[PDB]
Inverse folding.
């Protein structure tokens, strides 16, 4: 017989890294 | 004969994008 | 019959969190 249907979709990827730090604070 | 079994599960997705830059730092 | 083709790649992961606060001010 013919080949079977495509398999199930893969797991979602992992969450991305946090962004880099913000800029220096102001002179309050 | 009948169709074969479905294929293996797909690969995991790519890792998410990094987050954006953080907020300004606090006052001294 | 033979086994089917592999499934589609998973969805992309979610974006990461905003970064930490910056250095303290002067």
């Amino acid at each position: 017989g013919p080949p079977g249907p495509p398999g199930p979709r893969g797991q979602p990827g992992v969450m991305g890294f946090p962004g880099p730090p913000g800029p220096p604070g102001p002179c309050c």
Q: What stands out?
A: Chain A touches chain C through 28 residues (CB under 8 Å). Residues 6 and 19 of chain A are 37 Å apart (CA to CA). DSSP finds no helices and no strands in chain A.
